[PDB]
Amino acid sequence: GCVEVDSETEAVYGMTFKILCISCKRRSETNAETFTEWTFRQKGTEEFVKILRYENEVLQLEEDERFEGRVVWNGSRGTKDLQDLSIFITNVTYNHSGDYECHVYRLLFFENYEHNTSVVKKIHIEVVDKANRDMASIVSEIMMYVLIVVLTIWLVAEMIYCYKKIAAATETA
Amino acid sequence: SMEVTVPATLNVLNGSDARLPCTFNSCYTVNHKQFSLNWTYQECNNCSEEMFLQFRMKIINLKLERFQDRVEFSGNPSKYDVSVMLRNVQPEDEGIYNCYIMNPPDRHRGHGKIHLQVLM
Amino acid sequence: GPQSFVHFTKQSLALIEQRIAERKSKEPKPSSDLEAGKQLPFIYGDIPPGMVSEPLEDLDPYYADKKTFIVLNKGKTIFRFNATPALYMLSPFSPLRRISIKILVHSLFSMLIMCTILTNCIFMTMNNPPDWTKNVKYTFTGIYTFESLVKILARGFCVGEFTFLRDPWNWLDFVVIVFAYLTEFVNVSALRTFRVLRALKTISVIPGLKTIVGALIQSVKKLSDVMILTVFCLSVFALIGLQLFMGNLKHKCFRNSLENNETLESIMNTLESEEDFRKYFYYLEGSKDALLCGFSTDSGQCPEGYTCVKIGRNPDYGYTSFDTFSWAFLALFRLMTQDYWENLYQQTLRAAGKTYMIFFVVVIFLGSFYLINLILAVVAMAYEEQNQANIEEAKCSPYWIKFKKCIYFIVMDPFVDLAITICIVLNTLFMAMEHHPMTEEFKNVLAIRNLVFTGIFAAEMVLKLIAMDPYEYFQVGWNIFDSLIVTLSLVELFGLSVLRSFRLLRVFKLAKSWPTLNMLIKIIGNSVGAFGNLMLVLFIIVFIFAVVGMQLFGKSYKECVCKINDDCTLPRWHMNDFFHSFLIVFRVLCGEWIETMWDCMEVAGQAMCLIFYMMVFFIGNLVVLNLFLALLLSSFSANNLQIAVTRIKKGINYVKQTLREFILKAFGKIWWNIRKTCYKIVEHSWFESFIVLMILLSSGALAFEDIYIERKKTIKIILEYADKIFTYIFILEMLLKWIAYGYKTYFTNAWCWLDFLIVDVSLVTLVANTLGYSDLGPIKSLRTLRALRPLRALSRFEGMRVVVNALIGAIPSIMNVLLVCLIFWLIFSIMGVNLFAGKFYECINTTDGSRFPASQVPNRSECFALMNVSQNVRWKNLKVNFDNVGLGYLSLLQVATFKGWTIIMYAAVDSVNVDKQPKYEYSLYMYIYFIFFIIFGSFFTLNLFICVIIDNFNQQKKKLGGQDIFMTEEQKKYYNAMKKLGSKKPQKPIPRPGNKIQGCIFDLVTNQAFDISIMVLICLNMVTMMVEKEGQSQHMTEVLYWINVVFIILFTGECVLKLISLRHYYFTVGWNIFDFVVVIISIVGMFLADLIETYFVSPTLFRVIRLARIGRILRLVKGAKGIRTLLFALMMSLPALFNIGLLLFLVMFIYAIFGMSNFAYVKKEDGINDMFNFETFGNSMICLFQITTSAGWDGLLAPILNSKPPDCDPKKVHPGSSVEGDCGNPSVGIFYFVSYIIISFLVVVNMYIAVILENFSVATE
Ligand SMILES: CC(C)CCC[C@@H](C)[C@H]1CC[C@H]2[C@@H]3CC=C4C[C@@H](OC(=O)CCC(=O)O)CC[C@]4(C)[C@H]3CC[C@]12C
Ligand SMILES: CC(C)CCC[C@@H](C)[C@H]1CC[C@H]2[C@@H]3CC=C4C[C@@H](OC(=O)CCC(=O)O)CC[C@]4(C)[C@H]3CC[C@]12C
Ligand SMILES: CC(C)CCC[C@@H](C)[C@H]1CC[C@H]2[C@@H]3CC=C4C[C@@H](OC(=O)CCC(=O)O)CC[C@]4(C)[C@H]3CC[C@]12C
Ligand SMILES: CC(C)CCC[C@@H](C)[C@H]1CC[C@H]2[C@@H]3CC=C4C[C@@H](O)CC[C@]4(C)[C@H]3CC[C@]12C
Ligand SMILES: *[C@@H]1O[C@H](CO)[C@@H](O)[C@H](O)[C@H]1NC(C)=O
Secondary structure, X not given: OOOOOOOOOEEXXXXXXXXXOOOOOOOOOOEEEEEEEEEEEEXXXXXXXXXEXXXXXXXXXXXXXXXXXXXXXXXXXXXXXXXXXXXXXXXXXXXXXXXEEEEXXXXXXXXXXXXXXXXXXXXXXEEEOOOOOOHHHHHHHHHHHHHHHHHHHHHHXXXXXXXXXXXXXXXXX | OOOEEOOOEEEEOOOOOEEEOOEEOOOOOOOOOOOXXXXXXXXXXXXXXXXXXXXXXXXXXOOOOOOOOOEEEOOEHHHOEOOEEXXXXXXXXXXXXXXXXXXXXXXXXXXXXXXXXXXX | OOOOOOEOOHHHHHHHHHHHHHHHHHOOOOOOOOOOOOEOOHHHOOOOOOOOOOOEOOOOHHHHHOOEEEEEOOOOEEEEEEOOOHHHOOOOOOHHHHHHHHHHHOHHHHHHHHHHHHHHHHHHOOOOOOOHHHHHHHHHHHHXXXXXXXHHHHHOOOOOOOOHHHOHHHHHHHHHHHHHHHHHHOOXXXXXXXXHOXXXXXXXXXXXXXXXXHHHHHHHHHOHHHHHHHHHHHHHHHHHHHHHHOOHHHEEEEEOOOOOOOOHHHHHHHOOOHHHHHHHEOOOOOOOOOOOOOOOOOOOOOOOOEEEEEOOOOOHHHXXXXXXXXXXXXXXXXXXXXXXXXXXXXXXXXXXXXXXXHHHHHHHHHHHHHHHHHHHHHHHHHHHHHHHHHXXXXXXXXXXXXXXXXHHHHOOHHHHHHHHHHHHHHHHHHHOOOOOOOOHHHHHHHHHHHHHHXXXXXXXXXXXXXXXXXXXXXXOOXXXXXXXXXXXXXXXXXXXXXXXXXXXXXXXXXXXXXXXXXXXXXXXXXXXXXXXXXXXXXXXHHHHHHHHHHHHHHHHHHHOHHHHOOOOOOOOOOOOOHHHHHHHHHHHHHOOOHHHHHXXXXXXXXXXXXXXXXXXXXXXXXXXXXXXXXXXXXXXXXXXXXXXXXXXXXXXXXXXXXXXXXXXXXXXXXXXXXXXXXXXXXXXXXXXXXXXXXXXXXXXXXXXXXXXOOOOHHHHHHHHHXXXXXXXXXXXHHHHHHHHOOHHHHOOOHXXXXXXXXXXXXXXXHHHHHHOOOOOHHHHHHHHHHHHOOHHHHHHOHHHHHHHHHHHOXXXXXXXXXXXXXXXXXXXXXXXXXXHXXXXXXXXEOOOOOOOOOOXXXXXXXXXXXXXXXXXXXXXXXXXXOOOOOHHHHHHHHHHHOOOHHHHHHHHOOOOOOOEOOOOOOOXXXXXXXXXXXXXXXXXXXXXXXXXXXXXXXXXXXXXXXXXXXXXXXXXXXXXXXXXXXXXXXXXXXXXXXXXXXXXXXXXXXXXXXXXXXXXXXXXXXXXXXXXXXXXXXXXXXXXXXXHHHHHHHHHHHHHHHHXXXXXXXXXXXXXXXXXXXXXXXXXXXXXXXHHXXXXXXXHHHHHHHHHHHHHHHOHHHHOHHHHHHHHHHHHHHHHHHHHXXXXXXXXXXXHHHHHHHHOOOOOOOOOOOOOOOOOHHHHHHHHHHHHOOOOHHHHHHHHHOOOXXXXXXXXXXXXXXXXXXXXXXXXXXXXXXXXXXXXXXXXXXXXXXXXXXXXXXXXO
């Protein structure tokens, strides 16, 4: 079912990049109505400017030239109960670097009870010129080969040590 | 039929106080709002049902002028006894007294019949 | 000599009286033969025609002196009476007494009485009897009273040794008569209860039943120690559960936003109705209780806007709780008997946290299984010994001539009888071809075949009937079966169709060619006698219990229906009618008593239901159902096919030879030294060890891949590379092993084959991935087979290996039974299809799942018309139905494991026809099908499996030489020593210390009274711990604390007293060391817990620490010999149980990995919810533990079964997950669950039983 998973934090200049914002309901069977406001402050700047608002299957964009014609929706389609609120940047620009707030406003419908839930997510991204492999991948790859070579050494080293013993035994017999 | 226990006859000495026992063993618990008890009286055997005691979460007395103020309730219905008490019995009080029970949630409607006779 | 019979005339009375007087002035066992009731010995031969049925003189000498008179019936039955006149009114000469004896002994008397009893029973089963029924009651009472008077005539009224009142059956009849008289002149349910009882004693007297009754009585008398052990164990477990889960089942979800000035207290003071509570607490749709919740992170969660709180009532009317000790004991009895234990498990975990599965785990295995099987053990041994002792003590015309001759001549059993059975197979194959959406043409085709086939079989019957004289015909015990069926068929042709599936049973004649199947068949046959008598007593018992329940709780069930049902309509299981009562008692014997009892208690009240149900349950399940298995276990403790084969050898060989004749008429020292090198290596313990560790690590890697793997990214990467390393390691191992051992040796070992194959799949997958050949359907499928990597671990450990061998050694023998069982189930399934195919469809309102009134939607056309004008309507069909002989088998499995059966039974008993809307109990009496099927399936078949497997184990053992087949080499030495313990002789007496004081202290501690006192104090400490309840005041809590402090001080006191006198000798006794340990533990506990409550903040740990106090209570087992013996038996069985447990864990681990891969992301319905799913490893294993005991397996299966809309959606987003859709695979799901429950049965259930049986014996011996 729903699994809250974190966005990556590094886009490639000139390419496409997806911002993940996932907020599961505590109880899956509950009934809700959700909508979103995304605010963004550029790096080296201190104020959060809203960029878009998504409600009832319609995406509203603000006028900011940083995002006109280059953000689209990848959230939950045709539901009015979102649980997945993501943004696709087409043609990433160095301008998109900075901090993003994924404000979620949720209205849960209960037996004779309605709750106004609000939750906020923080995503800090930085635009680079080239995608670079994660520390883990590289380290895991070098540690993989060493284990092979170490073991393989331990085997063959063991093999001759005992082969000489076998030769000695044969000679004595 | 509901488990209603009433004495079909009761004889009382004129001028004295009489208690008219209506007791039920309806299995379901008594909810004050659901529970209804209505008390009537007949001058002659087949006369009009002269209601004198309603129940609306509390004791509602019609306060009859044939029964000026000698009538009060004599029980605690949540202990399933709904009897009625008459002070200073007199010979027009001779006649039929009837207790009718309703026990929601229980569907069945109960009936009690007591003929009070007055001594001299 | 023979004619020793002589009439008792006053003169022989006077000669007996004179002799007694002589004996008095002066101031021996009798012929068991001539015993009353027993037949006259043929030594006396025939009776003079005038002496029969007459007061005759006493034969037996023992009594010849005392005063008596014997009478014999025309069946030579000896009846002894008292010569003394009853109340000195009439004498042994008075004609009236003679008449009495005569009429009493005639066969008429007893036939009349039992007739009477049977018709009285039919009148008791009457929920609503008419007015003539009072007349018939009068009749009955009068007859019985008259019989009683007759009995009191012959024997007298409490006069001498032989009198009416002296026999207790007569006392019962007299008591019954008095109660009946009393009720009429001036209680009634009780009085009628007393009436029915007559059947019990009056019908157990018939031949055959008496032996079974004796075995039943002996079982109850021998179960004493076992029951005490059960009580003790259950009590301790309840004390543990009460500590851990007191008040936890009152956790609920309460609104955080409230109307102003509404505190929880005010809210509670006002709320009364269900709807009122839904408004303030959180309830799931279709739930009478609120959602349980918890305060931890493994516990159940609460919606947003609702917070958890301990307030309100416990679930299931207030009856499921660990708040007091009584309630806890009920829950523990439920867990021992496994009755809805799944519900308890689940609720408990939702409120306490999933980390308490350990507590449930322990109880189910070490508790439930061990106690249930120990009960079986004692009953089995009882039956066996009874049977043993029983065996021991026992030790025109010419035209007919022409016709008959010809017909016999032309039939040849050699061939004609065999082709017939082949055709029977054909025809049952054709009966399996019937389904629900069949075309009209297909119907007609199968119908024509039915005609043909019965015609074939009937021509045969008539032919044989003519050939062999109709007399000798009927004589055969197979010919009469055949005739019956053919007759039925032709009748029907000219509800019976379902009885032609029995012709199949004729195939067991040809089993007399497969030796083993033949032997199995014979064992069964031998058994059927007592099988039947047992069935009779069971039916009598159920009948009587059903009548009693209807008499006591029926009126209550009618009058208080609204309490147990929102619609105020009698629930599907009630007791206001005889039939429904029978059914509830039957359900208890199958083992489901807690739901019905809840309802009973809610209407009748708690005390009456507890006792009824308890008694009912005890006798039926614990005793009678165990006699089924005991009988079958004791049972285990011509061929014309070959004639035809010889004919075939003649033919195929001869004809081919003639055809051939016609055709002829027409026409490396170094390398060897290297093998030894790598042999050394692959055997060194270090290599072994390394490889075991690798196998272990590879398995944890499998477990790490959950639906949350993508949150954890580092781990994901690590694991890919790790899998690459592991494959290298294992391939290197394979190659070394091919150079050490050799291809030959290698591929002959089976463990090696397994390993080869796993390595091979992994190599394939690696190639694919590294070659870019991945992302294909086989490649993904192969990725799921990684879950068999866990198997390598199996080969390394010896215990798992021993268990697996035993099972492999039985496979040969399980198969035969499987063939016999499969045939029986096929019959039943074809029948089912015929009766219930297509009739399980309804028109529900999907908004709330409610079969429409059926006055508003009669058929299907109308369901569909409603779907046109409105939505949320569906012509839904049950998932597990009887629509084809395949789904039939699954339905049946559910009915026979008693999990999922109710859903099916209901729809059956509601069936109208094919396209018509089911109606409430239209076909109420369809339960009979299930009764009969239920019976066979769960009682004979499964017990047959158990018997066969256990017999196989005993044979495996015997061939080795009595060596345990479930224990390893080292574990066997330990077994030998532990057994030595139970047979250790008393050790030397401890020398008395010589300092006056110590001499005195010694004298005190060595007296038996000292220890009796200590025992009574332990018993009182148990009571102190049982009075603790949820909601006790601070006053009570304080008082109980100081009592426990005093108990601690006293036990420490007896310990130091012992240490003074015994000195070092104190630690040379194992029990004394246990006591020391407990003493220290107790003090430590007190102190530490006092600290946690004040200094620290850990309520959870407070509880877990205070579990120590129960150690003082465990010191009770020393005093009770009966309890400690069984515990010693359990201790010996522990090593064997360990290996089985390890095997179970491996299999469970593999299954969990498979589930995580396939059953994750399915629609959360039925058994699959938010806390019991297959999404993580943990959640997975919990579910699988449940199912190990075949509990709730059906619920988990239903979500998996639906693979199409509108049941499931293929495109479900699964945000945060690459996978799309919530659909599940039906083929995969059935196999995944069925296989597990079978494996479980063959491992945990059958192995546990064997071990217990083996060691119980050992311990008692
Ligand atoms: C006793 C043991 C050896 C079991 C073997 C019994 C066979 C004789 C029966 C059992 C399962 C039966 C099959 C189960 C279901 C299939 C498919 C079934 O077709 C449907 O289910 C139609 C469904 C639709 O129309 O949508 C028709 C009968 C048939 C061939 C059955 C043919 C006879 C089988 C093999
Ligand atoms: C991969 C698939 C498609 C084909 C191979 C499947 C394996 C499970 C088969 C192939 C060869 C089989 C083996 C062939 C021969 C034998 C000997 C046979 O047992 C004996 O000969 C008894 C020896 C003794 O008396 O101890 C049964 C087991 C075994 C190892 C078999 C076990 C199962 C094996 C490994
Ligand atoms: C090895 C087993 C199958 C032996 C015992 C079989 C009986 C339990 C079967 C044989 C024929 C069955 C009957 C055949 C026909 C019907 C109609 C059928 O549909 C109805 O309308 C039932 C009406 C009702 O009984 O209330 C279900 C009940 C009944 C009496 C069946 C009840 C169960 C019966 C007696
Ligand atoms: C209560 C219901 C189930 C009726 C039970 C009656 C039937 C099932 C029982 C009662 C007595 C039993 C019979 C008593 C003993 C024998 C003799 C044996 O050589 C063959 C089986 C046979 C003939 C039994 C068959 C089954 C049987 C007839
Ligand atoms: C009063 O009681 C009578 C009983 O005869 C009943 O018919 C009537 O409806 C009752 N009135 C109310 C308001 O309950």
